[PDB]
Design an enzyme around this catalytic site. Sequence first.
Site, PDB file in Angstrom:
ATOM      1  CG  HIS B  41      -0.590   0.167   2.524  1.00  0.00           C
ATOM      2  ND1 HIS B  41      -0.846  -0.771   3.503  1.00  0.00           N
ATOM      3  CD2 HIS B  41       0.138   1.130   3.121  1.00  0.00           C
ATOM      4  CE1 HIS B  41      -0.329  -0.360   4.649  1.00  0.00           C
ATOM      5  NE2 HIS B  41       0.297   0.777   4.445  1.00  0.00           N
ATOM      6  N   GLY B 143       2.496   6.433   9.664  1.00  0.00           N
ATOM      7  CA  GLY B 143       3.903   6.350   9.300  1.00  0.00           C
ATOM      8  C   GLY B 143       4.597   5.089   9.823  1.00  0.00           C
ATOM      9  CB  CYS B 145       2.633   1.042   7.233  1.00  0.00           C
ATOM     10  SG  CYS B 145       0.955   1.422   7.783  1.00  0.00           S
TER      11      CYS B 145
END
Lengths: 306, 306
Positions: B41, B143, B145
């Site tokens: 993603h 932030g 991920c």
Amino acid sequence: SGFRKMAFPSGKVEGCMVQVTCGTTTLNGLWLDDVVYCPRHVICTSEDMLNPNYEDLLIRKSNHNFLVQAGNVQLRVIGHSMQNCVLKLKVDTANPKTPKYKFVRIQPGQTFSVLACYNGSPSGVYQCAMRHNFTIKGSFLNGSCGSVGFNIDYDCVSFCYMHHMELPSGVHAGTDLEGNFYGPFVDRQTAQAAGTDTTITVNVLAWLYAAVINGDRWFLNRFTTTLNDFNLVAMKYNYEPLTQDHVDILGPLSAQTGIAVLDMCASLKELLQNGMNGRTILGSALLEDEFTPFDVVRQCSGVTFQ
Amino acid sequence: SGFRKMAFPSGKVEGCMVQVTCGTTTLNGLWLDDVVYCPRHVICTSEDMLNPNYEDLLIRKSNHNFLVQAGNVQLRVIGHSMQNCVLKLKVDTANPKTPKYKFVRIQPGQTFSVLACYNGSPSGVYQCAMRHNFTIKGSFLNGSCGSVGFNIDYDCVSFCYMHHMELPSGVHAGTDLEGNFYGPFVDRQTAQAAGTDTTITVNVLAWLYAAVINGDRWFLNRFTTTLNDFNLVAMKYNYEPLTQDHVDILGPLSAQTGIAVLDMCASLKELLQNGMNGRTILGSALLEDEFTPFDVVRQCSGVTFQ
């Protein structure tokens, strides 16, 4: 979201841990620049620890009696000095992995990360707090002495703790990196009582702010209170008296949440008086006091280190 | 003595974290050898996340659209591939700080350390467990991920988790390092319910052993029980049914303490039925289930890593 007891990343301190052996005793040292720091009781046998004369024991030791091993590398000791309860060993090689660092002596309530080490090798990392009775509630087995506590700020590692003792009650005592013990404790195997372990009120409040930020709001109540009225309650429950400096430190969290510090104190009051009635706050069934206001702002705004 | 939730030392994983940017999106990657792993993603806008077609979104991306930054060093991407829910970016440089590593997919109940990262920089380290409903209870802000979960064994880092999502309920979901989610979760911003969060019985028992080793013995009782009788109780309190494999895993701790597993189960039973009556076990007011039998043996026998 979510809220966890979270240590600093340990990598900068890993690179500083060495093994120090003197006769039959092995523990951990910290290698910064060309100096290795370790508990002076490295010079002691099991028997010596009953009633050591460190100055006399040290006389029968020379540079070559201190073996310092960094991984497999053997470091060469060219100088030694006893400073309070720590030995400083001058070595011929600067640690290449030395970070920016400082030695700080912390105040009760402040938190830090411990890197628990055995034989100069890191096994794990956890957070703890300097208690108001100058102990810490750690996890330390034989061989852990010389393991250090620290905080990081951007790139600077501030060492605040070196592990020296377990008290007969199973809590932990040690020194700053100048070798001065926190509290009244001594590096002797004798009876030593801790003192009353008071709850760190300003930390509990911070953690209440944290809970609110994270949606745990059930304990908020309709009431407010006064510093004096709250403190009457604190003193009954062995809570640190809250001061206006404490109120000041909580200001940013008050501002972010729109909950005045004294409203939060009145919630605390009712928790102390009524208990939790079997509910939880941020997954705990008791009031947590090992998060500082700074710890909460950190975790709640994702501050980062290099 | 003492018992703490304790992470692995993070240094080996610190050296692997990089920053990955694609258009306006920045998250963390893991740089092992000449491959950078990150959540797919990374190619998505905020809007895309409502209903992404990853295959189609990926078409409009080339090697040069993936900026990979290790500290200040910019790495050169010479190849990209989508594998399940992770992107693999081939770079022209092998990570010099690459450790021995493996990719493992863990089973519910197993624990690991998370190194929470922002912008490719580590902020902190905590322990968590893969829950029986395939979530984790982490601390993750925007932030985060691409932050990873791992275990260490001597010198080998086993990565088991990459952070991808927060569910609307505020718990956390992500993948193994092959990009397969734990559980039924998807990398789409839609409603996703977790499922029943059952207590990890074998972990609670381990932690009871730990308490006993550390002198917290008040909950030991006069009774024993049977696997079937205990499980009748477990199922009422949303506890995982205990199996004979569980009993086997607890054997060493049974042996060290001289307390048979089923005696320990009968203590647990009475705790579940009577509560804690306002006492604590190892400083907790509830039954802890994020220590594995291995975690306890580790902390109780000082195992060390290189």
